[PDB]
């Protein structure tokens, strides 16, 4: 017996196009998404060129429309020059992304005052998400309060961070957050196996106590999102390993295994991969869209999953229970048992759908 799930949403993926297409592109990354039971993705802006102005967004929209196999929305990225310049295109994006820790020069913000300027100028009804680690979580929460609006914290990875967010929620502050599978299923204990290159990710892998704390505070976690961050094995194993793990094809099987073990319920999972992403990012429903999974099938994660161009996975060797058998997207069979059956270009920009615009008060 298969279980029918709604179309799942991953609000944090790096699809590398334009400019890093040896690592992934829209066509390969969305194939990976479909194989992982994901029917809608939100793509991050740290491409080359980065999506930090209207022309770069226009290019990205066309590349995505031509290459995506599932539906999508594209983030804009905050820079040190673009506050106050994104108003005309803001509503067409998934949201605004702030890189508040390590990143490349084009997306670096040198001062908290620049964070404030973005919070003040970005339209108040549209999402803002932040890469914010450790004390940076508290700092960006302060900026959000000074500017009287909400913020969403990406990939919470530490006991310190989830407890801070928990305290903020207890005070009624408008903050939401997401957690990535590697911060729930890997830890320092895995670094010996992974090695120093493969093991590089930001936020870094946590201690057993960090992992435990995330599970214990599941009530505080609004969304799961992969932070799919593909790089090739050559890059990961080289002299300057870039941070990041591929994760679209492994996320749902890992979480289904946890459901099967009673670590969280099926509903807990669907709140975090469907309902909460929809409501935080104002993402529209997908008509005639669903995922069929087999919860009984036991398998071992191989050295690489079929679709991502990363061609490696840090979860190699983990035993899982649960598999995606079929995906239907807008009334077409998109995936069955290892075969993707919708072409590049089948996917659409959900922000262009009437039901995908974020509601706002008139001027």
Ligand X SMILES: O=C(O)c1[nH]c(=O)[nH]c(=O)c1F
- Per CB under 6 A, residues contacting ligand X are 14, 46, 131, 201-202, 229, 242-244
φ, ψ (nearest 5 deg) of residue 263: -80, -25
The neighbour count for residue 230, using CB atoms within 10 Å, is: 29
361 contact choice in its own copies, Zn ion, ligand X, none (CB below 5 to 8 Å, kind-dependent): none
Nearer Cβ to ligand X, position 7 or 230? 230
Nearer Cβ to ligand X, position 243 or 284? 243
Q: Applying CB under 8 A, does 160 fall inside the site for its own copies?
A: yes
Q: How far apart are CA 246 and CA 237, in angstroms?
A: 15
The residue annotated as part of the active site, out of 189, 227, 267, 268, is 227
164 contact choice in Zn ion, its own copies, ligand X, none (CB below 5 to 8 Å, kind-dependent): its own copies
What tokens does 122 get? 């970005």
Smallest separation, CB 294 to ligand X (Å): 31
Which residue is associated with the tokens 């194989």? Answer: 35
Long-range pairs of 129-132 with CB within 8 A, sequence gap ≥ 24 = 129/11, 129/12, 129/75, 129/95, 129/96, 129/97, 129/98, 129/153, 129/154, 130/97, 130/98, 130/100, 130/154, 131/97, 131/98, 131/99, 131/100, 131/101, 131/103, 131/155, 131/202, 132/98, 132/100, 132/101
Q: Applying CB under 8 A, does 318 fall inside the site for its own copies?
A: no
351 marked among binding-site residues = no
Smallest separation, CB 214 to its own copies (Å): 14
What tokens does 221 get? 């976690």
Smallest separation, CB 35 to its own copies (Å): 38
Q: Applying CB under 8 A, does 172 fall inside the site for its own copies?
A: no
Please report the DSSP string for 225-290 in residue order: ---B----HHHHTSSSPPP-B--HHHHHHHHHHHHHTTSS-HHHHHIIIIIHHHHHHTPPP-TT-E
Angle at 159 between CA 147 and CA 116, to 5 degrees: 15
231 marked among binding-site residues = yes
φ, ψ (nearest 5 deg) of residue 296: -100, -25
Paired strand residues for 99: 131
Q: How many residues does the chain have?
A: 363
- Please give the residues from 19 up to 48 whose contact with its own copies meets the rule CB under 8 A: none
Smallest separation, CB 114 to its own copies (Å): 9
Which residues contact Zn ion by CB under 5 A? 12, 131, 154, 227
Nearer Cβ to its own copies, position 159 or 236? 159
Q: How far apart are CA 76 and CA 14, in angstroms?
A: 13
Nearest residue by C-beta to Zn ion? Answer: 154
280 contact choice in its own copies, ligand X, Zn ion, none (CB below 5 to 8 Å, kind-dependent): none
Nearer Cβ to its own copies, position 33 or 164? 164
Q: Applying CB under 8 A, does 142 fall inside the site for its own copies?
A: yes
The helix-helix angle for 208-216 and 159-170 (nearest 10°) equals 30
From 80, 103, 124, 145, residue interacting with its own copies (rule: CB under 8 A): 145
What tokens does 113 get? 């005052």
228 marked among binding-site residues = no
Smallest separation, CB 200 to Zn ion (Å): 13
Nearer Cβ to ligand X, position 68 or 201? 201
Nearer Cβ to its own copies, position 148 or 303? 148
Smallest separation, CB 132 to Zn ion (Å): 9
Whether 349 is catalytic is: no
The neighbour count for residue 343, using CB atoms within 10 Å, is: 10
112 contact choice in its own copies, Zn ion, ligand X, none (CB below 5 to 8 Å, kind-dependent): its own copies
User: Would you list which residues are annotated within the binding site for (S)-dihydroorotate?
Assistant: 16, 46, 202, 231, 243
Under the rule (CB under 8 A), what is the footprint of its own copies?
A: 100, 111-113, 116, 134-143, 145-146, 159-160, 163-164, 167-168, 171
Active site residues: 227
């Amino acid at each position: 017996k298969l279980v029918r799930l709604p179309g799942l949403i991953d609000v944090h993926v790096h699809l590398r196009e334009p400019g890093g297409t040896h690592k992934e592109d829209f066509a390969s990354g969305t194939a990976a998404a479909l194989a992982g039971g994901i029917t809608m993705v939100c793509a991050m802006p740290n491409t080359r060129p980065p999506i930090i102005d209207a022309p770069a967004l226009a290019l990205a929209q066309k590349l995505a429309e031509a290459g995506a196999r599932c539906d999508f929305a594209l983030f804009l990225g905050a820079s040190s020059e673009n506050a106050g310049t994104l108003g005309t295109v803001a509503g067409s994006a998934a949201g605004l992304k702030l890189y508040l820790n390590e990143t490349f020069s084009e997306l670096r913000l040198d001062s908290v005052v620049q964070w404030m300027e973005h919070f003040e100028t970005w339209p108040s009804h549209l999402p803002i998400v932040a890469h914010a680690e450790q004390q940076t979580v508290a700092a960006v929460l302060m900026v959000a309060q000074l500017t009287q609006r909400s913020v969403h914290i990406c990939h919470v990875a530490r006991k310190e961070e989830i407890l801070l967010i928990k305290a903020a929620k207890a005070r009624g502050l408008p903050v939401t957050c997401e957690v990535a599978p590697h911060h729930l299923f890997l830890s320092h204990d895995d670094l010996e196996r992974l090695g120093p290159g493969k093991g590089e990710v930001r936020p870094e892998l946590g201690s057993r106590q960090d992992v435990e704390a995330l599970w214990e505070n599941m009530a505080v976690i609004d969304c799961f999102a992969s932070d799919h961050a593909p790089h090739t094995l050559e890059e990961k194993c080289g002299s300057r390993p870039p941070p990041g793990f591929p994760g679209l094809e492994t996320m749902l099987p890992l979480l289904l295994t946890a459901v099967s073990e009673g670590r969280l319920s099926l509903d807990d999972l669907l709140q975090r991969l469907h309902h909460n992403p929809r409501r935080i990012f104002h993402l529209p429903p997908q008509e005639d869209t669903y995922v069929e999974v087999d919860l009984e099938h036991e398998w071992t994660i191989p050295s690489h999953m079929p679709f991502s161009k990363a061609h490696w996975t840090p979860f190699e060797g983990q035993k899982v229970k649960g598999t995606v058998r079929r995906v239907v997207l807008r009334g077409e069979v998109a995936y069955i048992d290892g075969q993707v059956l919708v072409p590049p270009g089948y996917g659409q920009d959900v922000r262009k759908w009437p039901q995908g615009a974020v509601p706002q008060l008139p001027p």
